[PDB]
Amino acid sequence: RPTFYRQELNKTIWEVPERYQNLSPVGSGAYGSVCAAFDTKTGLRVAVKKLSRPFQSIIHAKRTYRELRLLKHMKHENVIGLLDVFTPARSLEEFNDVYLVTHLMGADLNNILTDDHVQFLIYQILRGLKYIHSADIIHRDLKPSNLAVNEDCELKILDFGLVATRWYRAPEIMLNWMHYNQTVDIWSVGCIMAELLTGRTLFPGTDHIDQLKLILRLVGTPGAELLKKISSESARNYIQSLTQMPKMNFANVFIGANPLAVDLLEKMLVLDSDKRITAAQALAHAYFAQYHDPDDEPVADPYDQSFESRDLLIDEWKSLTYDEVISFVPPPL
Ligand SMILES: COc1ccc(OC)c(CCC(=O)Nc2cc(-c3sc(/N=N/c4ccccc4)nc3-c3ccc(F)cc3)ccn2)c1
Ligand SMILES: CCCCCCCCO[C@@H]1O[C@H](CO)[C@@H](O)[C@H](O)[C@H]1O
Ligand SMILES: CCCCCCCCO[C@@H]1O[C@H](CO)[C@@H](O)[C@H](O)[C@H]1O
Ligand SMILES: CCCCCCCCO[C@@H]1O[C@H](CO)[C@@H](O)[C@H](O)[C@H]1O
């Protein structure tokens, strides 16, 4: 067990192993405070997140368990991974705080285009998405603030920020569709790619209604092939009661863009999620010919998500989280 040291920062206490030095607060964080730091053991600059009230309730405890399970599983260049996880607690009985460590990241996709850069950035997204989707994991919330980018133009998918979420959301989500397929994320990639090509948010709807209205103006109202798969009586009536609109030609909309990029957008931004191109198929699209390598686009180990359907007590999610802290094996050097 490492030797811990204790210090207060931004009016909250921090107890971390000695290896992490020069803690500098970077923000309040999503659900916990974050500091930059220097990892003396590896030489890496890192981010340490102290989760806030991680076992306050059953929802909080399951969410804490979920976050640790996800980060421990992700082992891929274009997906955020876990350098370390620790607690100052010496036993389950006194276990109350959880700290997560990963590589320090500077800019997100907003803070960073030529067509070569769009190719490379979207390629890395799809490569990380292929890995995530292969583990039966849906991101559901892809957007530029969730994508970290180096000056190297290297990119990682995150599930947090360092830009309304609705702008990149698949339409089936905003219709509160019961089931979702992995290509909700491909829709988001399409919106992101269009923005990198035009410099403008593709669908900057003010709300969900305005959002769907903007979407339909580009892709057209559902055809009969899609209408026959809509089970909601109300959703079907409203859709059909709209003035039908034709799917625009994307060449006209994305004028001057690389025609291969326009073609890929047409295969991504399809209403019928059954017809959207998958991440694996998109990596083989001719638009990525100079980056695509089928032998270096790996899939993930299977991810056991059975816990999502369980209703457990707080102390049980806490104990399961403790098991995952204890069993952690750091990445090698
Ligand atoms: C110009 O700008 C900068 C200049 C200098 C800087 O440094 C001194 C920085 C710091 C940049 C930074 O924030 N870098 C960072 C953050 C995280 C985060 S952010 C988060 N939640 N944030 C929210 C907040 C609100 C809503 C949603 C999410 N969680 C983790 C995190 C996740 C996992 C983990 F193991 C550790 C930390 C991870 C890695 N790098 C910026
Ligand atoms: C100013 C920066 C100081 C960094 C100190 C990192 C100290 C890591 O200290 C740890 O102490 C243990 C007990 O001696 C040893 O068993 C570990 O191998 C060692 O890494
Ligand atoms: C590797 C971390 C960045 C990519 C994360 C992709 C998966 C996000 O994961 C999703 O988060 C949702 C909200 O907690 C959960 O409800 C879903 O069950 C979970 O699959
Ligand atoms: C005007 C708004 C139209 C929204 C159309 C959304 C079509 C989404 O596509 C649908 O997604 C469902 C859930 O994954 C699938 O079960 C259906 O098979 C698929 O066609």
φ and ψ at residue 107, rounded to 5 degrees: -95, 155
Domain housing 257: 107-288
The experimental resolution of this structure, in angstroms, equals 2.3
| Total residue length of the chain | 333
Helix axes 314-326, 58-73, angle to 10 degrees: 20
220 known ligand binder: no
- Cβ of 171 closer than 6 Å to ligand 4, yes or no, is yes
Pairing of strands 45-51, 20-27: unpaired
Looking at the CA of residue 3, tell me the nearest atom of ligand 2.
11
Type and span of the H or E element at 274: none
**Strand-by-strand arrangement of the 147-149 sheet:** 107-108, 147-149, 155-157
Closest CA to 321 of 50, 57, 64: 64
DSSP-derived secondary structure for 107-135: EETTT---HHHHHHHHHHHHHHHHHHHHT
DSSP-derived secondary structure for 63-99: HHHHHHHHHHH--BTTB---SEEE-S-SSGGG----E
Strand blocks (E) in the chain: 4-9, 12-17, 20-27, 32-39, 45-51, 84-86, 99-103, 107-108, 147-149, 155-157
Query: The domain that contains 217 carries what CATH number?
Result: 1.10.510.10
Residue nearest to atom 15 of ligand 2 (CA): 2
- Other Cβ atoms less than 10 A from the Cβ of 295: the count is 5
Q: What is the torsional sign of CA 107, 113, 114, 115? A: positive
Ligand 2 centroid to Cα of residue 42, in Å, is 12
Residue 105 to residues 34, 77, 155, 171, 255, Cα–Cα distance (Å):
12, 13, 10, 31, 34
Tokens of 120: 């490379």
CA angle 290, 293, 296 (to 5 degrees): 140
Query: Which of 138, 212, 271, 278 most suits a substitution to test ligand 4, by most atoms within 8 Å of the C-beta?
Result: 271
287 known ligand binder: no
Q: Which ligand is nearest to the CA of 178?
A: 4
The one-letter amino acid at 220: G
Cα–Cα dist 137/76, whole Å: 14
Cα–Cα dist 226/172, whole Å: 12
Q: Which residue has 């295969």 as its token pair?
A: 267
Cα–Cα dist 230/244, whole Å: 17
Cα–Cα dist 199/204, whole Å: 13
User: Taking CB atoms and a 6 Å cutoff, what residues make up the pocket around ligand 2?
Assistant: 2-3, 18-19, 21, 40
Count Cβ neighbours within 10 Å for each residue of 181-216 and write b for 16 or more, e otherwise.
bbbbbbbbbbbbbbbbbeeebbbebeeeeebbebbb
- Cβ of 140 closer than 6 Å to ligand 4, yes or no, is no
Closest CA to 85 of 123, 50, 111: 50
Please check whether residue 180 is in contact with residue 140, taking contact to mean a CB–CB distance below 8 angstroms. yes
Residues involved in catalysis: 159
Cα–Cα dist 298/77, whole Å: 10
What DSSP state is assigned to residue 151?
S
205 known ligand binder: no
Looking at the CA of residue 19, tell me the nearest atom of ligand 2.
6
